[PDB]
Amino acid sequence: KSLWELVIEQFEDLLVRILLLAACISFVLAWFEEGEETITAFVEPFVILLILIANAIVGVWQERNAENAIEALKEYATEQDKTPLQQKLDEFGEQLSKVISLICVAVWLINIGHFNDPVHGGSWIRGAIYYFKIAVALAVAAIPQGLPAVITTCLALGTRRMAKKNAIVRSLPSVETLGCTSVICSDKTGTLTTNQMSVCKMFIIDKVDGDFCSLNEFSITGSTYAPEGEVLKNDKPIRSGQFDGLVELATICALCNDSSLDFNETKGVYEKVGEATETALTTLVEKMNVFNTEVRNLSKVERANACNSVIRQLMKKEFTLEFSRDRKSMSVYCSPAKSSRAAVGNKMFVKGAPEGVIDRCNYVRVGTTRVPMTGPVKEKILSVIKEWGTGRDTLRCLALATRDTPPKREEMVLDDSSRFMEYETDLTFVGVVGMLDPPRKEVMGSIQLCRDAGIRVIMITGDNKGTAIAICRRIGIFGENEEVADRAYTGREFDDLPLAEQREACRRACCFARVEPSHKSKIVEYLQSYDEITAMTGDGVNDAPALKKAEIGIAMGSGTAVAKTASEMVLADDNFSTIVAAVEEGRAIYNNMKQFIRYLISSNVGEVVCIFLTAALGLPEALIPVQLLWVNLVTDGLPATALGFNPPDLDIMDRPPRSPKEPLISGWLFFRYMAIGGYVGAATVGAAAWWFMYAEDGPGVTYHQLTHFMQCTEDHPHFEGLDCEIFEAPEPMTMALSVLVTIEMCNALNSLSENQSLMRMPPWVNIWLLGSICLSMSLHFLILYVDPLPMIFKLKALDLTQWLMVLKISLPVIGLDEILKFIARNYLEG
Template sequence: MPTELSGLTSTQVAQRVAAGQVNTLPARSGRSTWDIVRANVFTRVNGILFVLFCLVVLTGNLLQGAFGLLIIANSVVGIVQELRAKRTLDNLAVVGEAHPVVVRDGVRTRITRDEVVLGDLIAVAPGEQIVVDGSVVAADYLELDESLLTGEADPVPKRAGDAVLSGAHVIAGSGLYVAEKVGADAYAAQLTAQAAKFTLVSSELRQGINRILRWVSYLLVPVGALAIFVQFDQPDTTWQESVLRMVAVLVPMVPEGLVLLTSMAFALGVVRLGRRQCLVNELPAIEGLARVSVVCADKTGTLTQNAMTLGEVVDLTDDPGHTRRVLAQLVAADPAPNASMQAVAAAVEPADVPWPVVARAPFTSARKWSGVSFAADGGHWVLGAPDVLLGHTEVGRRAEEIGAGGRRVLLLARAGQPVDAPDAPGPLEPTALLVLDQLMRPDAAETLAYFDEQGVALKVISGDNAASVGAVTRSLGVDLGEVIDARTLPSPGDKFDDTVEAVGVFGRVTPEQKRQMVGALQHRGHAVAMTGDGVNDVLALKDADLGVAMGSGAPATRAVAQIVLLDDRFATLPHVVAEGRRVIGNVERVAKLFLTKTVYAIALALVIGLMGLPNPFLPLQMTVVGWFTIGIPAFLLSLAPNRERAKPGFVWRTLAVAIPCGLIVAGVTIATYVTTRGFGEVADLHQEQASTATLIALILTATWVLAVVARPYYWWRVGLVAFAYGFYFLVFALPWPRHALGLDVTHTTEIVFGVVAGVIGMGLVEATWWVTRIVRGERTDVWAQPKAAAP
């Protein structure tokens, strides 16, 4: 492997590319197009429906097999949405991934991580990620955080010859390393590959749905077997009619659209957020969005812009010219300047002749200062936080007064010993205070106001001076309460947790404290979102329920975050939270519809089967009911805005509606069927009339389940319910749909009985909605409140 600091030549790079020695990683969005097609076509639900459709085809009555269209709909919609999500993530991932700097032909060039070849010389600076395995060839006070690999948060110093592993990131210093393992051979290659992967991995919502479906599958086997036996045991019935009535029993038991709509809602969420330049690294993050109760925001890069300007230099000596010369030398000695040093560099004249450097101490968030020791009479100089370096001295108090106005203050001081000494910096001689001006993000105030209105608590957690941070938040028009210097916080424990929950603004927070604060809030039952852009935010982002990184932030923060705001707009965050609430709230809403249908279908099959009666319905009748009472309304409801914060307990909250409402629908249907038909053998005309009355009762009651699930009402939701009832009225009123569905409305008494039974069912569903909401302590708003009006 070459270790020359000029790196590989263009010829060597071409040879390695031809030999396949490139850092090729798995596809960013996980599944290939064929995998997506196969996963959406060959599903358990599609398999069940296909077998039942084939049975209907054998009877020669293709119209009764209209439910087979669900196979096509399930597959096409699922494929289209996942391919859209895949394309969105692929495009965004190219922007969001790490772009390492390689040295080739002696020139530094920024490339994509997939273009790194074996033997490449890669340059790293603070905040950048190690993208392939290798060994260090040059180190300038290089320190790595390997917590993503080892779980240990302490920085690891690296010198020439030391090994580095992909997945680590630089927290201080700079260096060069040579790529020794690339692609799948790298120790942690999968970390960055999975950062932009479209996955449907475990989440509370999916686990809850899978648990419910598992319970349903246990019931389907015995109930289905009973239905098959009873329908084929009916006297004077052709096998074709028995098959049709058996299929009509089994089809409604399958919650065919629930999994589809859940996947579709997630995929649509990815696409919608992608349009706002928001990269979703992990799909369940959308679920986390809906549950967020606390947002922990870093100040720099989140509330303020990364760029700073040097407002003024408050000289504490009689030689301001010397102060400027020292600043110029500090700039010249820093190979990887941070935002503060870049502001200084823009304001001072470059050094004519750099002073020889004998020692350097790069800036770290834990230390809060950086320093350089120059040869001869250049001296030892430090630049950092005045309150950390000086404490409560006169100069320290003066810096505090300036910082109270929201400006950032740094102390330039001459140290009494080399900056790399174990007890550095030692005695200090204050030389100047550097006052940096920070630009507020224009959308920060509006974003903070949104969270306040939505009942989401906000914590500003910053490494800057506490008074300065407090002044910034107040300037945005939001009062977050008390401001605390994190150095005064008690050790982690109950008192620490109490303080973190009660206080809104923290300054001088170390990276480890940020992590502890996230843990304290989680311990108190909060779902925590952490925003950040710097390497000091990595630990907290990794531990938070939802990590949100800025697109211009350090590659390490983008690698561990679930969501990356590629355009750095903090104002995107309300849209992100709203999208999560829309997805989760609407999936829960439609789940109640689908499972209500499953409950009443199973109850009908079980009770009517035990009675030995033929199924009252035909497949086409149940298909129409499924489409217009559940399928189409559920699809529209799944796309609508939803601003309610998601709460745990999805399974029981869903079943608390689905089970009683499903049993009410089943009870009304059975009562109508038994009353209008009676037991024993009956004439075909009487069977058809009784089935018609029974279908009326079922439709009236089941559609009212839609009416209560759609609450709180907006006008369009009322229109949705009205459309369903209006459609069914036309089905029974017009001759051709009656004929197609096998309906007979000529027997007035039975029709009236079906209508009355349906109205009673509607009343029971309404009463159940009120009782269950009151018992669970939930809001009973029938109409949406004005402030929550849907856009």
């Protein structure tokens, strides 16, 4: 059950029922009076009922549009769980219910002296019932009904829109927190950058003298997974079969990888089989072709695996050593089979992260030579390792080596992967392949959007800290000259920090490189310590316990279904930009709720000001009960509902993330409610008071007469030349009514955005609201001009002259908010 539904939606229904009851009591009592057997006696109950029918029709169509949105999305627990927002809306509704109740009792109490008035027949009871019908009808009107159905729509409206932007939400209460997101922690590879990495640069050993180590760098072209491209040396097109060093490197590439290149004929472009990393080497082999096999004549469907198949028989893989996270490399054992190359012994190819394959290296091959890995051969090639991955391109270096004297196959463990590393201690060295994946377009811009939004991004990659930082500088996470030695840590560094110092690091960090699986859950632990709403991404099962600890666990479309199920939202895009585009939508929905609430509260305040003002001033009452019901049906109805179709605001990603601690209504916003409320409630009684004092063929009276109108029968000398029954005239009541309905249709236009002016976001930015306004307006004109109708609601037709007065009075309500929305943008926001 819902506390808001119980105290507002249901309470409003009982009020209508007891209102109708009050009507039918007046019906029975209007029999014992004389001349009251007229055919007007049934009219009032017949209207309160007839309006209740239309108010119900609105309810049905408002519920039918809500259940459809939820179902259209779905198509294509000991009762103790509620969102902080749901706890606030239920606290709100309880206050509104209580406040309106006191307010309406006060309406009935301030009219005690008006009970025995001659207008009621001179009976105290007959008047005491009337003002009861007033207070109750006001209570029905004042109540902001329809909230849950409008939210339910918006909640599913954005969800359909998020799915359009590849953002697939697991749960619905999740999207509320998406807008409150403070920190977005995301994996670099696959998300912040596409998985289309190819080998663009590569270098090997050229000439070696003590402290004179020379390198032979190469630059390959064609960063697509295709043999399209030629290897270049010093910007000079040279065949790969011109250097003996490329021979050894190409050999390891095609033998250590388990990646194929199935050219899909229907695609037209070469595709990828296996892993993205290893696939690049396969494309590298074809683009090099040191064997100088016939290339062009081989068809598109086989060329990709052509030069790759030349080595499939040159040697043959015996067994392949698996990858281990500790060693950070992998190896194959290849005794030359079917090639008569077994006479020249057998070798062992390895492939992995530089440092591991260099520290555990003792020899450096020079084309077809062997040299003991000394000092200069190490530091003067690892300088290139650094300057490659730290430059403009930010390459992912991958050292390639070979073991000329491998341990016997008669001695090898397989159940223990930690032993694998010990089989790779002594080996030669060939070269290193520079490899890059490109960051997605405008991630740098999507990073920017977060910064403006006050949302912090934290990168979690597997690169070294040097290139990890270089990546952040490329995508604007870090400044090009900012000292980031305080905002970037590694697995070894973060663990070497004091426990209390570690959480302090998470208050400033934006990058993490070479990270243990346990750190992700350990970072969320620290981010939650600073009370930050954390959106964490993941792909592996190592991320699984972290996607439950984080506020918004974010999975991957290409990721395993284990994380996709145990998350709150899944990226079918595998894009980082999808994360923030879904954050934006989370904010857009909450704003749409605040526009809905603002319109109702502000307007309905005036409706309460209206009744209280005329009573406190001494003016003839502006509204009878059945008119108050018409105000509600027309303003609290379709126009307010269509407010849930407002477009996303403009100042949406510039304001800081909304805290769950923030009250539902701020101080300024409450004042803003009262101000607009204050005006419409005064502008409506000033409309009726205008008919009296200043209107043409509206009996011009002094303000003093109008205030003391009850003495008209007595004060003949003070009310000379006037008719006492003119204070019961329908024209002023029509002016008050027409203004109130118009000024609320104008106030609806104020709720297309919270702070953006109507100049920035025009009234036609929401067509559904325009139609709603048109409908309510035409419906009001129907009551005024279709002859049986004005008699019923005690109204008279308005001519063009006094319809313009309605405009002159109403339209400034747009003017007032524009004054306030100006102050909000320029004196509060920024």
